[PDB]
Design a protein around this ligand. Structure first.
Ligand SMILES: [Cu+2]
Length: 235
């Protein structure tokens, strides 16, 4: 159970974004139904009043939390990967629009899941803002908790992969558009019962064998990190 509190831009806190520039759901419960309209931007997808201004090449940091800011972030049980997607805001997340900017699943070198490193990072993970056309975008941050993913939700609705999905309203101002955004995947639709990485048993299958759900990270993506960019406690 986790939510996005707000974002940082080049290490500058943009402040509480909940129901302001984040399309916040009413609570931290996961989405589990892969064919749900809720897979797009969680259960309360609507235009919120603010879009965070950034330029291509800025470091954009998502900050997650559990109950209160800078707490346990997400239950340590919730091992799994983190991805970030982008879509043009005019799409409302509908259609073949979601382009993957970031993937981190299981790090063999460190022996840790992305979620494990997200807790250590006080809920902070970042992307480089891509050189797409200036305009309004949705950045869809997605944590998959796999602790109950041995079952498909479609076979046992009490279990299944848990999607913590948060859509941030970002406005890209300065961008040379050196990497025009292509068409993407649909949510719901990109993940099905047979998609690699959706049905996985963390108790019995080594994390070294885990393959995150496609799609692949876009050739235009400039990278990211799971690491604390800003200290919420100084505020
Ligand atoms: Cu949970």
């Amino acid at each position: 159970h986790t939510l996005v509190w707000g974002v940082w831009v080049n290490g500058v806190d943009q402040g509480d974004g909940r129901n302001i520039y984040i399309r916040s759901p009413p609570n931290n419960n996961p989405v589990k139904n892969l064919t749900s309209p809720d897979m797009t931007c969680n259960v309360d997808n609507r235009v919120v009043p603010k879009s965070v201004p950034v330029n291509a090449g800025d470091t954009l940091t998502f900050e997650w939390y559990h109950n209160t800011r800078d707490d346990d972030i997400i239950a340590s049980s919730h091992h799994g990967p983190i991805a970030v997607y982008i879509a043009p805001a005019a799409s409302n997340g509908q259609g073949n629009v979601w382009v993957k900017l970031f993937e981190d699943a299981y790090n063999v070198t460190n022996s840790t899941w992305a979620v494990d490193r997200l807790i250590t990072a006080h809920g902070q993970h970042s992307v480089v803002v891509p050189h797409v056309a200036p305009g309004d975008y949705l950045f869809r941050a997605e944590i998959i908790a796999l602790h109950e993913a041995d079952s498909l939700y479609s076979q046992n609705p009490i279990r299944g992969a848990q999607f913590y999905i948060s859509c941030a309203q970002i406005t890209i101002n300065s961008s040379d558009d050196s990497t025009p955004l292509p068409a993407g995947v649909p949510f719901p639709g990109a993940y099905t019962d047979s998609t690699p990485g959706i049905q996985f048993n963390i108790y019995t299958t080594p994390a070294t064998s885990y393959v995150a759900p496609p799609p692949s990270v876009w050739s235009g993506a400039l990278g990211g990190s799971i690491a604390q960019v800003g200290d919420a406690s100084l505020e």
